Amino acid sequence: SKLEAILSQEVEAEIQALLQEAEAKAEAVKREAEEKAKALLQARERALEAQYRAALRRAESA
Amino acid sequence: PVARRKPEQFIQTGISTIDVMNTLVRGQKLPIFSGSGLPANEIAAQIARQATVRPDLSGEGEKEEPFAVVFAAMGITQRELSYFIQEFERTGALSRSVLFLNKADDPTIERILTPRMAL
C-alpha cells in the first residue's frame, strides 16, 4: 500500500535519528573526559611543585 | 610627627580576610581585640610564619625588606612555649627574629619592662 509506505519511511527516519542522537551524546561524554583528565593532572602537578619549592625552603633555612 | 612617611601600601602575608577584606597597611596599629575565650597563639603564629610582605603587585623589587620578626607575648604558659618551639622550629623565623616572652613564672618586675625592649 501507499499507506504502509508512509509507515516505513517514518519508522526508518526514527532509526536514523536515534543513531544520530547517540553520536552527539557520545561526543558529549567524550568531551567530559578530555577536560576532566587534563583538569586532574595539572592541579596535582602544580601542588607538588609548590610542596617542593616550600620543602627546600625549610632545608635552606636550616 | 612631621618626619614620618605617609602610608601608601599594604603588606602581604598570604592570610586572607585579614589582608583582603580588611587590609593590613604599613605602620598600622593592628589590634586584635580578640575572642579571648579562644587563645591567640595559633592564629597568631600561624599568621606569623605564613605572613610575608612582598611588593610584587607594585612591581617594585622584593629583595629590599629584611624581614624581621619580632615577637612578644607575656605571662606565658609553658604550654604555649612548646607551641612556640613547635611553630618556630619549622620557620626560619625561628631565627630571623626575637622572641621575648615573659614566662608565667617570670617575675612581675621584668614583666613590666618587657614591652619596651624589642620595641
| Counts of helices then strands in chain B (DSSP H, E) | 4, 4
Kindly report the number of other CB atoms within 10 A of residue B96's CB atom.
Answer: 13
Q: Is B14 on the interface with A (CB under 8 A)?
A: no
The CA distance from B82 to B77, in Å, is 9
Looking up cell 623589587 gives B61
* Chain centroid to CA B17: 17
Experimental method: cryo-EM
Q: Chain A residue with minimal CA distance to B95?
A: A61
Q: How far is A58 from chain B (nearest CA, A)?
A: 7
B92 touches chain A (CB under 8 A): yes
The Cα–Cα gap between B44 and B32 comes to 10
Q: Are B13 and B19 in contact (CB under 8 A)?
A: yes
For residue A44, how many C-alpha atoms fall within 13 Å in the half-sphere facing its CB?
A: 6
User: What separation in angstroms does the CA of B9 have from each of B53, B57, B73, B110?
Assistant: 10, 11, 27, 36
Burial of B80: CB neighbours in 10 Å, binned 0-12, 13-18, 19+: buried
Closest CA in chain A for residue B92:
A61
- Backbone φ and ψ of A39, nearest 5°: -80, -20
CA distance A40 to chain B (A): 25
The residue type found at B1 is: P
The CATH code for residues A1-62 is 1.20.5.620
So where are chain A's domains?
Answer: 1-62
Residues 30-59 of A with CB under 8 A from B: 58
Radius of gyration of chain B (CA): 16
Q: B81: burial class by Cβ within 10 Å (0-12, 13-18, 19+)? A: middle
Tally Cβ neighbours within 10 Å of residue B60: 9
**B48 min Cα distance to partner chain A (Å):** 15
Q: What is each CA distance from A12 to A22, A24, B28, in whole angstroms?
A: 16, 19, 78
Contacts of A61 in chain B (CB under 8 A): 91-92, 94-95
- What is the 3 state secondary structure string of chain A? CHHHHHHHHHHHHHHHHHHHHHHHHHHHHHHHHHHHHHHHHHHHHHHHHHHHHHHHHHHHHC
